[PDB]
Short mmCIF file of C-alpha atoms and ligand atoms in Angstrom, two decimals:
data_model
loop_
_atom_site.label_atom_id
_atom_site.label_comp_id
_atom_site.label_asym_id
_atom_site.label_seq_id
_atom_site.Cartn_x
_atom_site.Cartn_y
_atom_site.Cartn_z
CA UNK A 1 102.90 68.76 101.79
CA UNK A 2 103.72 68.33 105.53
CA UNK A 3 107.17 68.61 107.31
CA UNK A 4 109.70 65.75 106.74
CA UNK A 5 109.77 62.96 109.30
CA UNK A 6 113.23 62.51 110.71
CA UNK A 7 114.61 58.97 110.84
CA UNK A 8 117.43 58.13 113.15
CA UNK A 9 119.58 54.90 113.09
CA UNK A 10 121.05 54.84 116.67
CA UNK A 11 123.40 52.56 118.67
CA UNK A 12 120.94 51.93 121.59
CA UNK A 13 118.09 52.99 123.59
CA UNK A 14 117.39 53.78 127.26
CA UNK A 15 115.08 51.36 129.24
CA UNK A 16 112.91 54.40 130.52
CA UNK A 17 112.06 57.85 129.22
CA UNK A 18 111.70 59.15 132.95
CA UNK A 19 114.48 61.77 132.28
CA UNK A 20 116.79 61.16 135.33
CA UNK A 21 116.74 57.33 134.72
CA UNK A 22 117.41 58.00 130.85
CA UNK A 23 120.70 59.53 131.74
CA UNK A 24 123.29 57.59 129.64
CA UNK A 25 124.90 58.02 126.03
CA UNK A 26 121.48 57.13 124.47
CA UNK A 27 118.71 58.59 126.49
CA UNK A 28 119.35 62.28 126.28
CA UNK A 29 118.86 62.54 122.42
CA UNK A 30 115.51 61.47 123.10
CA UNK A 31 114.43 63.27 126.41
CA UNK A 32 115.96 66.46 125.37
CA UNK A 33 113.18 66.49 122.75
CA UNK A 34 110.29 65.68 125.22
CA UNK A 35 111.27 68.02 128.06
CA UNK A 36 112.99 71.51 128.95
CA UNK A 37 114.98 72.54 131.89
CA UNK A 38 114.76 75.97 133.78
CA UNK A 39 118.07 77.21 132.26
CA UNK A 40 119.53 75.78 128.94
CA UNK A 41 122.97 75.71 127.42
CA UNK A 42 123.06 77.47 124.05
CA UNK A 43 125.94 75.50 122.33
CA UNK A 44 125.66 77.87 119.19
CA UNK A 45 125.80 81.20 121.17
CA UNK A 46 127.58 83.98 119.28
CA UNK A 47 128.25 81.88 116.20
CA UNK A 48 130.15 79.04 118.17
CA UNK A 49 130.59 75.51 116.42
CA UNK A 50 128.22 73.61 118.84
CA UNK A 51 130.54 74.01 121.96
CA UNK A 52 129.66 77.37 123.52
CA UNK A 53 129.18 77.30 127.24
CA UNK A 54 126.76 80.11 127.47
CA UNK A 55 123.63 79.39 129.67
CA UNK A 56 120.31 81.22 128.84
CA UNK A 57 116.78 81.44 130.01
CA UNK A 58 114.54 78.38 129.20
CA UNK A 59 111.36 77.52 131.52
CA UNK A 60 112.47 80.15 133.88
CA UNK A 61 112.52 83.68 132.26
CA UNK A 62 114.89 84.90 134.96
CA UNK A 63 116.70 83.89 137.98
CA UNK A 64 118.52 85.37 140.93
CA UNK A 65 120.91 83.89 143.38
CA UNK A 66 119.87 84.97 146.88
CA UNK A 67 122.82 83.67 148.83
CA UNK A 68 125.19 80.83 149.20
CA UNK A 69 122.36 77.98 149.33
CA UNK A 70 119.33 79.39 147.34
CA UNK A 71 118.34 80.67 143.94
CA UNK A 72 114.93 82.03 143.01
CA UNK A 73 113.45 81.32 139.54
CA UNK A 74 110.65 83.28 137.93
CA UNK A 75 108.67 81.08 135.58
CA UNK A 76 107.65 81.47 132.01
CA UNK A 77 103.77 81.91 131.94
CA UNK A 78 101.36 79.86 129.95
CA UNK A 79 103.72 77.11 129.16
CA UNK A 80 101.73 73.82 128.57
CA UNK A 81 102.86 70.31 129.21
CA UNK A 82 101.67 67.85 126.28
CA UNK A 83 98.56 66.86 128.06
CA UNK A 84 97.42 70.61 128.35
CA UNK A 85 98.24 71.12 132.18
CA UNK A 86 99.91 74.47 132.58
CA UNK A 87 103.32 74.56 134.01
CA UNK A 88 103.59 76.01 137.53
CA UNK A 89 105.91 76.20 140.46
CA UNK A 90 104.16 73.23 141.76
CA UNK A 91 105.78 71.17 139.01
CA UNK A 92 109.20 72.33 139.47
CA UNK A 93 108.94 71.74 143.22
CA UNK A 94 108.02 68.35 142.65
CA UNK A 95 110.78 67.83 140.25
CA UNK A 96 113.27 68.80 142.80
CA UNK A 97 111.49 67.24 145.84
CA UNK A 98 112.62 64.67 148.61
CA UNK A 99 109.55 62.61 147.26
CA UNK A 100 110.53 62.24 143.69
CA UNK A 101 114.30 62.80 143.52
CA UNK A 102 116.76 62.89 146.53
CA UNK A 103 114.98 61.66 149.68
CA UNK A 104 115.13 58.21 150.86
CA UNK A 105 111.67 57.39 149.27
CA UNK A 106 113.01 58.26 145.90
CA UNK A 107 115.60 55.11 146.04
CA UNK A 108 113.45 52.73 144.25
CA UNK A 109 111.98 55.26 141.69
CA UNK A 110 115.16 56.97 140.58
CA UNK A 111 118.00 54.67 141.96
CA UNK A 112 120.79 57.30 141.36
CA UNK A 113 118.57 60.46 142.01
CA UNK A 114 120.26 60.90 145.46
CA UNK A 115 123.83 60.12 144.81
CA UNK A 116 123.67 62.55 141.61
CA UNK A 117 121.79 65.38 143.39
CA UNK A 118 123.14 68.26 145.60
CA UNK A 119 122.42 68.38 149.27
CA UNK A 120 118.88 69.64 148.59
CA UNK A 121 116.34 71.06 151.10
CA UNK A 122 112.86 71.11 150.07
CA UNK A 123 112.07 73.72 147.26
CA UNK A 124 109.97 76.93 148.38
CA UNK A 125 107.04 77.70 146.23
CA UNK A 126 106.39 81.49 146.67
CA UNK A 127 103.58 81.66 144.13
CA UNK A 128 102.18 79.96 140.86
CA UNK A 129 105.21 81.28 138.91
CA UNK A 130 107.98 81.74 141.59
CA UNK A 131 110.04 78.79 143.13
CA UNK A 132 113.24 78.90 145.15
CA UNK A 133 115.61 75.92 144.94
CA UNK A 134 117.60 75.40 148.25
CA UNK A 135 120.53 73.41 149.59
CA UNK A 136 120.65 72.45 153.37
CA UNK A 137 124.62 73.14 153.20
CA UNK A 138 126.41 75.95 150.90
CA UNK A 139 126.39 75.11 147.24
CA UNK A 140 127.71 77.30 144.38
CA UNK A 141 126.53 74.67 141.82
CA UNK A 142 122.70 75.30 141.99
CA UNK A 143 122.85 77.05 138.51
CA UNK A 144 124.90 74.47 136.83
CA UNK A 145 122.84 71.74 138.17
CA UNK A 146 119.54 73.27 137.08
CA UNK A 147 120.90 73.51 133.38
CA UNK A 148 121.86 69.80 133.53
CA UNK A 149 120.27 66.51 132.56
CA UNK A 150 119.18 65.87 136.21
CA UNK A 151 116.80 68.82 135.82
CA UNK A 152 114.29 68.29 133.01
CA UNK A 153 111.01 69.37 134.45
CA UNK A 154 108.12 66.71 135.01
CA UNK A 155 104.39 67.43 135.62
CA UNK A 156 103.56 66.74 139.17
CA UNK A 157 99.81 65.33 138.93
CA UNK A 158 100.46 63.22 135.92
CA UNK A 159 103.78 61.71 137.31
CA UNK A 160 102.39 61.01 140.83
CA UNK A 161 99.31 59.26 139.19
CA UNK A 162 101.30 57.02 136.82
CA UNK A 163 104.40 56.51 139.13
CA UNK A 164 108.07 56.57 137.86
CA UNK A 165 108.09 53.30 136.01
CA UNK A 166 104.73 53.81 133.86
CA UNK A 167 105.58 57.50 133.53
CA UNK A 168 108.92 56.32 131.93
CA UNK A 169 106.83 54.36 129.31
CA UNK A 170 104.35 57.33 128.64
CA UNK A 171 106.12 60.66 129.22
CA UNK A 172 104.65 64.03 129.36
CA UNK A 173 106.86 66.93 129.11
CA UNK A 174 106.84 70.60 127.80
CA UNK A 175 109.41 69.93 125.00
CA UNK A 176 109.33 70.46 121.22
CA UNK A 177 108.34 66.87 120.42
CA UNK A 178 105.81 64.63 122.33
CA UNK A 179 105.55 60.88 122.80
CA UNK A 180 103.99 58.48 120.28
CA UNK A 181 105.35 55.21 121.16
CA UNK A 182 108.09 52.95 122.80
CA UNK A 183 108.83 49.51 121.74
CA UNK A 184 111.44 48.40 124.50
CA UNK A 185 114.83 47.55 122.81
CA UNK A 186 113.60 48.55 119.12
CA UNK A 187 112.30 52.02 118.76
CA UNK A 188 110.90 55.44 120.12
CA UNK A 189 108.60 57.61 117.92
CA UNK A 190 108.04 61.21 118.76
CA UNK A 191 105.73 63.90 116.97
CA UNK A 192 105.93 67.60 116.62
CA UNK A 193 104.36 69.70 119.58
CA UNK A 194 103.02 72.52 117.76
CA UNK A 195 101.87 74.33 120.98
CA UNK A 196 105.67 74.47 121.92
CA UNK A 197 106.51 77.71 123.81
CA UNK A 198 109.93 78.00 122.17
CA UNK A 199 111.25 77.60 118.43
CA UNK A 200 108.61 75.45 116.67
CA UNK A 201 109.54 71.99 115.82
CA UNK A 202 110.71 71.56 112.03
CA UNK A 203 110.25 67.72 111.67
CA UNK A 204 106.70 66.19 111.72
CA UNK A 205 107.98 63.09 113.48
CA UNK A 206 111.20 61.67 114.89
CA UNK A 207 111.93 57.83 115.03
CA UNK A 208 114.92 56.46 116.91
CA UNK A 209 115.51 52.91 115.44
CA UNK A 210 118.09 50.81 117.12
CA UNK A 211 120.73 49.35 114.88
CA UNK A 212 123.23 47.83 117.20
CA UNK A 213 125.68 46.63 114.56
CA UNK A 214 127.62 49.88 113.24
CA UNK A 215 128.14 48.34 109.52
CA UNK A 216 124.25 47.62 109.23
CA UNK A 217 123.72 51.25 110.40
CA UNK A 218 126.35 52.68 107.87
CA UNK A 219 124.29 50.37 105.06
CA UNK A 220 120.96 51.90 106.00
CA UNK A 221 122.33 55.55 105.45
CA UNK A 222 123.71 54.43 102.18
CA UNK A 223 120.51 52.74 101.23
CA UNK A 224 118.37 55.83 102.14
CA UNK A 225 116.63 54.16 105.20
CA UNK A 226 118.02 56.96 107.77
CA UNK A 227 118.52 60.44 107.64
CA UNK A 228 121.02 60.57 110.51
CA UNK A 229 123.19 57.73 112.08
CA UNK A 230 124.93 57.83 115.45
CA UNK A 231 128.06 56.36 117.05
CA UNK A 232 130.33 55.68 114.26
CA UNK A 233 134.09 55.81 114.35
CA UNK A 234 136.74 57.90 112.35
CA UNK A 235 137.44 54.63 110.22
CA UNK A 236 133.95 54.93 108.71
CA UNK A 237 134.46 58.65 107.47
CA UNK A 238 136.22 58.11 104.18
CA UNK A 239 133.63 55.58 102.90
CA UNK A 240 130.65 57.77 103.98
CA UNK A 241 132.21 60.99 102.46
CA UNK A 242 132.82 59.37 99.05
CA UNK A 243 129.16 59.48 98.64
CA UNK A 244 128.23 63.00 97.17
CA UNK A 245 124.92 63.18 99.14
CA UNK A 246 126.23 61.92 102.60
CA UNK A 247 128.69 63.58 104.99
CA UNK A 248 130.02 62.86 108.53
CA UNK A 249 129.63 65.36 111.30
CA UNK A 250 131.70 65.05 114.26
CA UNK A 251 132.88 66.62 117.33
CA UNK A 252 134.79 65.82 120.46
CA UNK A 253 132.33 65.69 123.28
CA UNK A 254 132.38 66.24 127.21
CA UNK A 255 132.55 62.63 128.12
CA UNK A 256 135.37 60.07 128.68
CA UNK A 257 135.38 56.47 127.90
CA UNK A 258 136.72 54.05 130.65
CA UNK A 259 137.12 50.56 132.04
CA UNK A 260 136.22 49.75 135.46
CA UNK A 261 135.91 46.89 137.94
CA UNK A 262 133.76 44.89 140.26
CA UNK A 263 135.85 45.67 143.47
CA UNK A 264 133.64 42.87 145.27
CA UNK A 265 135.61 40.31 143.37
CA UNK A 266 138.73 38.89 145.39
CA UNK A 267 141.09 39.80 142.51
CA UNK A 268 140.12 43.36 142.53
CA UNK A 269 139.78 44.24 146.14
CA UNK A 270 143.27 45.60 146.37
CA UNK A 271 144.51 48.21 144.03
CA UNK A 272 147.74 46.42 142.81
CA UNK A 273 146.18 44.57 139.83
CA UNK A 274 143.97 47.32 138.93
CA UNK A 275 146.95 49.65 138.80
CA UNK A 276 148.96 47.07 136.83
CA UNK A 277 146.16 46.89 134.24
CA UNK A 278 145.82 50.88 134.08
CA UNK A 279 149.79 50.93 133.78
CA UNK A 280 150.00 48.93 130.61
CA UNK A 281 147.35 50.73 128.56
CA UNK A 282 149.07 52.61 125.72
CA UNK A 283 146.52 55.25 125.06
CA UNK A 284 148.48 57.02 122.10
CA UNK A 285 148.57 53.95 120.01
CA UNK A 286 144.85 53.36 120.58
CA UNK A 287 144.00 57.03 119.54
CA UNK A 288 146.34 56.44 116.35
CA UNK A 289 145.01 53.09 115.14
CA UNK A 290 141.35 53.46 116.13
CA UNK A 291 140.43 57.19 116.20
CA UNK A 292 142.64 58.56 113.58
CA UNK A 293 144.14 61.01 116.10
CA UNK A 294 140.52 62.53 116.58
CA UNK A 295 140.09 61.38 120.37
CA UNK A 296 141.74 63.36 123.20
CA UNK A 297 143.56 61.84 126.15
CA UNK A 298 142.99 63.82 129.41
CA UNK A 299 145.61 64.63 132.25
CA UNK A 300 143.65 62.77 134.60
CA UNK A 301 139.94 63.24 135.79
CA UNK A 302 140.20 66.70 134.62
CA UNK A 303 138.54 68.36 131.57
CA UNK A 304 138.40 71.91 130.42
CA UNK A 305 134.66 72.21 130.95
CA UNK A 306 135.32 72.38 134.52
CA UNK A 307 136.41 76.09 134.07
CA UNK A 308 137.88 77.50 137.42
CA UNK A 309 138.58 73.76 138.41
CA UNK A 310 140.12 72.46 135.24
CA UNK A 311 144.09 72.18 135.93
CA UNK A 312 146.04 72.72 132.66
CA UNK A 313 149.29 72.18 134.55
CA UNK A 314 148.57 68.56 135.14
CA UNK A 315 150.88 65.63 133.76
CA UNK A 316 149.71 63.10 131.51
CA UNK A 317 148.45 59.66 133.19
CA UNK A 318 151.23 57.04 133.73
CA UNK A 319 152.24 54.45 131.23
CA UNK A 320 154.95 51.98 132.62
CA UNK A 321 154.82 48.58 131.37
CA UNK A 322 157.83 47.51 133.53
CA UNK A 323 156.18 48.72 136.71
CA UNK A 324 152.83 46.85 135.51
CA UNK A 325 154.75 43.53 135.29
CA UNK A 326 156.13 43.95 138.73
CA UNK A 327 152.63 44.85 140.26
CA UNK A 328 151.34 41.62 138.63
CA UNK A 329 153.94 39.58 140.25
CA UNK A 330 153.29 41.37 143.63
CA UNK A 331 149.54 40.87 143.55
CA UNK A 332 149.81 37.17 143.66
CA UNK A 333 147.72 36.88 140.38
CA UNK A 334 147.78 33.25 139.20
CA UNK A 335 147.34 33.51 135.40
CA UNK A 336 143.40 32.71 135.54
CA UNK A 337 141.36 34.39 132.83
CA UNK A 338 139.62 37.65 133.82
CA UNK A 339 136.66 38.60 132.00
CA UNK A 340 135.83 41.91 130.47
CA UNK A 341 132.08 42.83 129.62
CA UNK A 342 131.02 44.89 126.64
CA UNK A 343 127.53 45.46 125.05
CA UNK A 344 128.96 45.03 121.61
CA UNK A 345 129.91 48.40 120.19
CA UNK A 346 127.38 50.52 122.23
CA UNK A 347 130.44 52.64 122.76
CA UNK A 348 132.25 53.53 119.63
CA UNK A 349 135.43 51.36 119.18
CA UNK A 350 134.47 49.32 122.32
CA UNK A 351 135.62 45.75 120.93
CA UNK A 352 138.48 47.05 118.75
CA UNK A 353 139.82 49.06 122.00
CA UNK A 354 139.43 45.70 124.01
CA UNK A 355 141.11 43.61 121.44
CA UNK A 356 144.18 46.05 121.57
CA UNK A 357 144.01 46.12 125.38
CA UNK A 358 143.86 42.27 125.57
CA UNK A 359 147.28 42.16 123.70
CA UNK A 360 148.74 44.78 126.03
CA UNK A 361 147.74 42.88 129.17
CA UNK A 362 149.02 39.51 127.60
CA UNK A 363 152.42 41.19 127.32
CA UNK A 364 152.27 42.27 131.27
CA UNK A 365 151.31 38.40 132.03
CA UNK A 366 147.42 39.11 132.56
CA UNK A 367 144.97 36.98 130.48
CA UNK A 368 141.67 38.94 129.75
CA UNK A 369 138.81 37.39 127.92
CA UNK A 370 135.94 39.36 126.22
CA UNK A 371 132.39 38.67 126.94
CA UNK A 372 129.63 40.12 125.36
CA UNK A 373 126.19 41.01 126.43
CA UNK A 374 122.95 41.79 124.73
CA UNK A 375 121.17 45.42 125.08
CA UNK A 376 118.98 45.26 128.11
CA UNK A 377 120.77 42.04 129.33
CA UNK A 378 123.59 43.68 131.76
CA UNK A 379 125.08 40.65 133.56
CA UNK A 380 124.52 39.96 137.33
CA UNK A 381 126.96 42.02 139.20
CA UNK A 382 128.82 39.03 140.66
CA UNK A 383 129.44 37.41 137.26
CA UNK A 384 131.29 40.53 136.22
CA UNK A 385 134.92 41.43 136.80
CA UNK A 386 136.11 44.18 134.26
CA UNK A 387 133.47 46.25 132.11
CA UNK A 388 133.69 49.23 130.04
CA UNK A 389 131.59 52.55 130.85
CA UNK A 390 131.53 56.18 130.12
CA UNK A 391 130.98 59.47 132.04
CA UNK A 392 129.42 62.64 130.72
CA UNK A 393 131.02 65.57 132.48
CA UNK A 394 127.62 67.24 133.16
CA UNK A 395 128.69 70.51 135.02
CA UNK A 396 130.82 73.56 134.57
CA UNK A 397 132.76 72.35 137.61
CA UNK A 398 134.82 69.30 138.67
CA UNK A 399 132.28 68.09 141.17
CA UNK A 400 130.68 66.13 138.29
CA UNK A 401 131.55 63.21 137.74
CA UNK A 402 134.15 62.37 140.33
CA UNK A 403 131.87 63.16 143.35
CA UNK A 404 128.56 61.87 142.08
CA UNK A 405 129.94 58.60 140.59
CA UNK A 406 133.13 57.88 142.75
CA UNK A 407 132.37 59.71 146.01
CA UNK A 408 131.40 58.28 149.42
CA UNK A 409 127.50 58.11 148.45
CA UNK A 410 128.18 56.96 144.98
CA UNK A 411 127.67 53.61 143.06
CA UNK A 412 131.50 52.75 142.59
CA UNK A 413 131.92 52.60 146.40
CA UNK A 414 128.51 51.33 147.48
CA UNK A 415 127.58 49.03 144.66
CA UNK A 416 131.00 48.17 142.99
CA UNK A 417 132.95 47.90 146.17
CA UNK A 418 135.67 50.51 145.93
CA UNK A 419 137.21 50.88 149.41
CA UNK A 420 138.26 54.29 148.90
CA UNK A 421 140.90 55.90 151.36
CA UNK A 422 139.23 58.04 153.92
CA UNK A 423 141.11 61.12 152.63
CA UNK A 424 139.34 60.91 149.35
CA UNK A 425 136.01 60.99 151.01
CA UNK A 426 137.00 63.84 153.25
CA UNK A 427 138.00 65.91 150.34
CA UNK A 428 134.63 64.91 148.49
CA UNK A 429 132.88 66.43 151.19
CA UNK A 430 134.91 69.62 151.25
CA UNK A 431 134.76 70.38 147.64
CA UNK A 432 130.82 70.00 147.88
CA UNK A 433 130.44 73.15 150.05
CA UNK A 434 133.51 75.09 149.51
CA UNK A 435 133.44 78.14 147.05
CA UNK A 436 136.14 78.33 144.28
CA UNK A 437 139.54 79.25 145.40
CA UNK A 438 143.04 77.83 146.03
CA UNK A 439 141.76 75.35 148.83
CA UNK A 440 139.02 74.00 146.61
CA UNK A 441 141.30 73.67 143.45
CA UNK A 442 144.14 71.89 145.40
CA UNK A 443 141.48 69.42 146.89
CA UNK A 444 140.43 68.41 143.45
CA UNK A 445 143.96 67.95 142.37
CA UNK A 446 144.65 65.72 145.41
CA UNK A 447 141.42 63.75 144.80
CA UNK A 448 142.65 63.15 141.08
CA UNK A 449 146.05 61.78 142.39
CA UNK A 450 144.27 59.30 144.86
CA UNK A 451 142.00 58.27 141.89
CA UNK A 452 145.29 57.37 139.72
CA UNK A 453 146.84 55.61 142.63
CA UNK A 454 143.66 53.66 143.40
CA UNK A 455 142.60 52.78 139.84
CA UNK A 456 138.88 52.14 140.80
CA UNK A 457 138.36 52.97 136.98
CA UNK A 458 140.88 53.74 134.23
CA UNK A 459 140.45 56.82 131.88
CA UNK A 460 140.95 55.83 128.18
CA UNK A 461 140.09 59.07 126.23
CA UNK A 462 137.35 61.47 125.16
CA UNK A 463 135.55 60.19 122.13
CA UNK A 464 135.43 61.98 118.95
CA UNK A 465 131.62 61.49 118.33
CA UNK A 466 130.81 60.84 114.68
CA UNK A 467 127.52 60.88 113.15
CA UNK A 468 126.60 60.80 109.40
CA UNK A 469 123.68 62.31 107.70
CA UNK A 470 122.29 63.25 104.44
CA UNK A 471 123.55 66.46 103.19
CA UNK A 472 119.92 67.81 102.74
CA UNK A 473 119.34 67.30 106.64
CA UNK A 474 120.90 70.38 108.19
CA UNK A 475 121.81 69.61 111.67
CA UNK A 476 125.01 70.37 113.78
CA UNK A 477 126.45 68.11 116.44
CA UNK A 478 126.98 69.68 119.95
CA UNK A 479 129.92 68.82 122.27
CA UNK A 480 127.66 66.71 124.52
CA UNK A 481 126.11 63.20 124.53
CA UNK A 482 122.90 64.49 122.97
CA UNK A 483 121.32 65.82 119.95
CA UNK A 484 119.85 69.38 119.78
CA UNK A 485 117.25 70.36 117.10
CA UNK A 486 116.04 73.65 118.61
CA UNK A 487 117.04 76.17 115.88
CA UNK A 488 119.19 73.44 114.50
CA UNK A 489 117.21 71.10 112.25
CA UNK A 490 116.06 71.85 108.69
CA UNK A 491 115.58 70.27 105.42
CA UNK A 492 116.26 71.01 101.57
O1 LIG B 1 126.40 53.89 130.47
C1 LIG B 1 125.23 52.96 130.61
C2 LIG B 1 124.47 53.12 132.08
O2 LIG B 1 123.72 54.35 131.97
C3 LIG B 1 123.48 52.02 132.09
O3 LIG B 1 122.19 52.22 131.22
C4 LIG B 1 120.95 51.73 131.00
C5 LIG B 1 120.31 52.92 130.12
O4 LIG B 1 118.83 52.84 130.28
O5 LIG B 1 120.61 52.15 132.26
C6 LIG B 1 120.02 50.90 132.80
C7 LIG B 1 120.28 50.71 134.41
O6 LIG B 1 119.96 51.94 134.88
C8 LIG B 1 120.86 49.81 131.93
O7 LIG B 1 120.17 48.37 132.17
C9 LIG B 1 120.62 50.51 130.61
O8 LIG B 1 121.46 49.86 129.51
O9 LIG B 1 124.18 50.69 131.79
C10 LIG B 1 124.71 50.60 130.51
C11 LIG B 1 125.08 49.07 130.34
O10 LIG B 1 126.32 49.02 131.38
C12 LIG B 1 125.93 51.60 130.39
O11 LIG B 1 126.53 51.37 129.24
#
């Protein structure tokens, strides 16, 4: 009798298991198993229900902040990567290097590495088990960055030999499960790493099988094909819970769903029609109709996980149908249909939400039409106008995701053409280097106000992430877009 193999029915798969390129709603549930970070979040600290904020040692046994721009890490000794190579400071230095991650040479290998990274200087290797991470300018975000999904540790020699692309198809990490196979757009299979330095894996094997249609995914749990299924909606809860051997398990996660624009298109170069579309979205009626009250509507680009830079005083985002109609008229919009691209229901409630917004927009005089696209076939940028997206809020600080995504160095401005006000970009630079205080707090509030004025994206809500599982598979969700199995997976 060997350990049970775990069968997962998932909404989607990443195109690469290179851990930075796998950042998405579907990559972390896999790369969290293959790799470790220096510091890890313990969502279950002191009995919490999967939402604790505590950081604990992981690949680093201890660490110390030296000054405003450096942190020294002492590494756990005798940790082995899946191919046997011992983890050393040289691997950590390479993970956070100019070459691999944030320098100009990393642009083709990890396209978002520089824009999502801090203003890093080269790491300093002090000895085989001691490494210092540094920024060129002050950064009080080194610790939260190192605990995050940007900071999974890769093996220097193996990664350099294969290159980022081939490493992404045959990954080697220090994590509790090791790579077996990756069939693009179909499945990922991992196996127990019984040499793991931490809590030993409890499943013999893990299979991530794509089941893009949620109804088929629910039928596969009912029939006994899957142990756990992902990305359901609250409308599936009553049916699943009627089965005595199945149950749903859900939690609000530190992510928001949104829609955004290709601002290289003429109709979206100016803010007026973006604002008109934002002002016509009735979020509470969408939360009632599609989420059974379980989703949460934030007061702007502002979330409690930001800690000292969360503002609980902020007003709700605006809803004004009559001001929206007047903006449609002033924009010169001529009635032509505007497309909105969606990858089916990769996002829970994506197509039901869009159908509701299409009617809301018809009532303001804007004609929007759904265009679907297949997994791994994202349209050419110049064929897209509106599209859905999401952002995981990956730091204990407001820096992420407004600055990495929407800042002067980010993709919304550089790729998608948002001509941000100069004041917004000046504030992004200030919050990057400032320590917490009134100046920094007020700068984030001004950035949030400009974001709502400009509408380069429209925040909808934080999703209630719904899984379903067999009652004999013990596993709790966490408040983030990943699955955790360390000390959180057992059978019987
Ligand atoms: O939020 C998703 C984005 O991260 C991105 O995701 C994938 C995941 O591997 O990343 C590549 C591009 O880096 C993309 O082709 C894959 O789907 O895009 C999707 C689709 O827009 C986002 O939903």
